[PDB]
Amino acid sequence: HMDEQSVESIAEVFRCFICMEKLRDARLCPHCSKLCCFSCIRRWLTEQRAQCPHCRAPLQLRELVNCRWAEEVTQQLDTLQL
Amino acid sequence: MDEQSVESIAEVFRCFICMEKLRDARLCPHCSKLCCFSCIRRWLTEQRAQCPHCRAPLQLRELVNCRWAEEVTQQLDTLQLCSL
Ligand SMILES: [Zn+2]
Ligand SMILES: [Zn+2]
Ligand SMILES: [Zn+2]
Ligand SMILES: [Zn+2]
């Protein structure tokens, strides 16, 4: 149950700041490194305000970083959560 | 716990340049590969100012500070210990 809680601690890092679900098409804020689903952060920047939902820095959709490995890490974490 | 699942994840969180665990992890905005701050800064000074992986123009400032990287590194360590 300790390997279990380590997995869960990692999974928590790779959850969307906005919807707190596991990340789909992860995007990372360049200024603070918080991760969001593409759709979530797109909707935020587009319907809420042009700033990072966590760090509040000005932010346009195109400054967002594609976290290319996120989907693999996320799938692996799924495998681990038996 | 699948050993290779864990190892796959650990590969992601090794420094592309020195292969060790990340120290003050930075991420290349263009390909999102991770490097120790010190390693990538040396690289950019010594080698062409290109990501050692994306090979794309990369300067010190475009570098993303991965604030959660240490946390993950620490947990990975515990996971790897759990070979027992
Ligand atoms: Zn931010
Ligand atoms: Zn989301
Ligand atoms: Zn390094
Ligand atoms: Zn790169």
Could you say which ligand is closest to the alpha carbon of residue A36?
2
Angle (CA) A16-A21-A25 rounded to 5° is 60
Sequence-distant (6+) residues with CB within 8 A of A34 are: A17, A28, A52, A53, A54, A55
Ordered alpha helix ranges (H), chain B: 3-12, 37-46, 69-81
Resolution in angstroms comes to 2.3
**Chain B residues within an 8 Å CB radius of A33:** 27, 64-68
Task: Inspect the interface and report whether the beta carbons of A68 and B2 lie closer than 8 Å.
Answer: no
Q: Using the structure block, give the residue that is written with the tokens 């495998």.
A: A79
Domains and CATH numbers, chain B: 2-84 (3.30.40.10)
Count Cα atoms within 13 angstroms, Cβ side, for A10.
27
- Residue length of chain A: 82
Closest listed residue to residue B12, CA positions, set A35, A1, A17, A69? A69
Technique used: X-ray
Q: Chain B residues within 8 A (CB-CB) of chain A?
A: 1-2, 5-6, 8-9, 12, 27, 29, 31-32, 64-68, 71-72, 75-76, 78-79, 82
Could you say which ligand is closest to the alpha carbon of residue A37?
2
Asked if B28 contacts A64 with a C-beta cutoff of 8 angstroms, the reply is no
State how far the Cα of A61 lies from the Cα of A44, in Å rounded to an integer. Answer: 10
Q: Which of A1, A33, A78 to mutate to test the interface with B (most CBs of B within 10 A)?
A: A33
